[PDB]
Amino acid sequence: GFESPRPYKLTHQVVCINNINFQRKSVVGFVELTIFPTVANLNRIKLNSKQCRIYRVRINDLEAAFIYNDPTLEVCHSESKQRNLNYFSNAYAAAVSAVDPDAGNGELCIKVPSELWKHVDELKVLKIHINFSLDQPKGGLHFVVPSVEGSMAERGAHVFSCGYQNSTRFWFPCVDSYSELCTWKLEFTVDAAMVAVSNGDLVETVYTHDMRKKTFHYMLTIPTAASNISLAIGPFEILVDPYMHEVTHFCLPQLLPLLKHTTSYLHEVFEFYEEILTCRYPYSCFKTVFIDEAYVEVAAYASMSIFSTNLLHSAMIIDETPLTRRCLAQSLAQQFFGCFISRMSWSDEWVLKGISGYIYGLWMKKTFGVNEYRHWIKEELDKIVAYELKTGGVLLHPIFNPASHLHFSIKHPHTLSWEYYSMFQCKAHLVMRLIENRISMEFMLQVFNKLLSLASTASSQKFQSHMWSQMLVSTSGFLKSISNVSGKDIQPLIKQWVDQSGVVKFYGSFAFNRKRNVLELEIKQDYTSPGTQKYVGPLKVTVQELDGSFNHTLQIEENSLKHDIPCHSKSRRNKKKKIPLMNGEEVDMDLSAMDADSPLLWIRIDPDMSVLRKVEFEQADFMWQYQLRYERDVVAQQESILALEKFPTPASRLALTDILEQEQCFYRVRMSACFCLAKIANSMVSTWTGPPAMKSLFTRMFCCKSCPNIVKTNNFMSFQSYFLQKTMPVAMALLRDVHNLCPKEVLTFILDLIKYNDNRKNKFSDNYYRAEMIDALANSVTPAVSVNNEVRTLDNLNPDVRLILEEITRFLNMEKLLPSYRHTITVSCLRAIRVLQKNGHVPSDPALFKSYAEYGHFVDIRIAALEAVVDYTKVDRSYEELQWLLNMIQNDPVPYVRHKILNMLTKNPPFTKNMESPLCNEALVDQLWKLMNSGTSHDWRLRCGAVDLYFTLFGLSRPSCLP
């Protein structure tokens, strides 16, 4: 049951936009809402509006009086001397709650005229006509206007609606909540050479009487929220999908072949999401818009998605096809379960984020294989256990503070830190995988189909929300639908992993009792760390003995420590028979390293990742080597690679080398075995016999049979030896001699890989392989032996580093004339120059990176150069570079770059709270408090980034470096 927090119900909204002026960055328009009051004596009506100048408001064609105030413009007063962050977080939460449409509130308060009170008490319709104007928007609509001359379509100028969550208040007045569903009528009067893309279906396109402008009329009969309404106006090249004909793809001019190749996969994503769920795609059209200077890499609205143009690749670009493919896939998953089925509160957001991430993981499983699915699930689980042990924990479904261990309030999406938002979505889809583990996948897809079917029977009624609230899901409704389809309720699993905000830590060690033939496990939990919680459920453990692989369920109550499980025979060591594996197959194992008295080959605690856990198991090194070689699970091979770094014995070198030589191993395991072999080789110097590690293996796999030092000409058509070939010198460059310097046998090998590179014969580009070659050249740089702080000049350069510097100069200059796909070699060469500057080789001068961080460059070059400037101002304690970065945060045209500068200055801070630094003035505290209070008031993501930066630099209490 859904009861509105608003005293009115909104039925229909007309959004008309005229006079989109690109020179002056200005729009004019009106908005006409059709509300039905649910309570009599409505009097004031409270709507949401930011940055719009409200000209006039007429209610039922009668002139009404409005008052506007935004408390989130300046959160705390300018003349308050408070400088602690808990004060700002409480004031910012109160300010966002005072404009919240999820309460009754709002920023624009319109007073109902007196003569309509007899129209409002007996509950009859009210039609509110606001007309507004955005004079030069700092948020919401982003105007990308290039400075080439010509007409606005000839120079490539466009507008798009940017922002996250409820940010539609930034470009027209609305009820900007996900729970106020209404039908829509959208008119946009644009230039005749431009096209206006928006939500709904385009019913017509009429000309103006001078035929210089045309009006696009859109209609949206599926009741969506105001937060799902978008806009993209530009000189877009239109491409109808040749497979599905209601799907149109819009790109920027001159990028039509890239659009043709890139969006050619999307019909398979449509077919997948419509056959695992049994509902068809709910909207009547689908539109993909590719734009410049995007807010996020992929945004999903109702019947529309806005991607950045940096996803567009051609047919000869690999290492970008899977990333763009999965961006399209998660946009479509959010089309199904973020835009059609919406949110009932700010709680129950974990339901939608979990269903979107879970069905996108099912797509990844079918498309890229079960092994890529397991690797992705393991990397997400490692991400969340790292974040939750780092700071507190992520609390899905809080109850309204519920989480007081962290420096922001979790009551609203616009007060969350961006890393918390990312980990929120990550934990939501892992908890949905856990619900699939308890209640099987076919019942899970039946739950999702029941939600979609209730929403689509709801979506066709005309009753104003008598039935339109069946399109809003809640937690209680989701659990009730689960209990309807399965008969089991998941309330212990919901109580543990949703309502409780923690992950578990397992420390395991075993001992084999030879007398009674049992395996005595010893599993203890660390439940006193700040991020942890105590697990009391069951726990699966998989033991591989000589007779095969056996699963055991252990009951781990609070007082439990020793778990005795039984062991089988050892009669497959009496005769040589094959040892049967986890799957149905069996292999020949070399049992010379195994103990004579124990049959068990390896043990895995929680193999299926059925809890949110971090396992620290103490096996013997031969058990880790057997688990690396003969396991049929990629997460166990990865964890054995990760645990073999502590055992540098030559049997582990043989194990990793046999993994590296082995095709029919998953390629991301061999790419990890490269770096593990490099670390082991560095640890057993003065024992290593022959050549450096992986060199003979590289010449055996990727070089000519007649010439060992000449590499084969590039043929990248295998896509697994391409990735292994481009990752093996990067790990090989981490080799070090007894003198702690990279050997001149590996550096010469990398330089010969660079010289003899011929790419005139493959059908694929070479930009990522050459960029990884520059990364391998950067890995070999050891710190220089400066004497008496000698100035680093050209004559006293290292003889090794002069070759590296010549190569990166040649590569960067050749990129200036023949550019790569996304300037990958510019990014790699800037990263390598920063590596050479971090050691004492090149003079520590930020002027090159400051010239590459200007506005007109590509955004990857910009963020690489700004990362180098952030690293410089951390190491050299530069005041003027920090003022340069803070000025670039305040006034840069691209808001993604501002968010990225705040992000990089949070990750690599110039000082922490423990450090005494020269950059701990009252001036810097006043600048960052002014940046939290004012200055970042237009983005909701810059303000949370400024809160994160103030927390990283000064902590939760009063800045110490202050009177």
Binding site: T321, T367, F368, G369, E372, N583, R632, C665
Partner: peptide, 13 residues
Amino acid sequence: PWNLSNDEYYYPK
């Protein structure tokens, strides 16, 4: 750009 998960060797059915 493709499957690249050697699935027939890890999960044979």
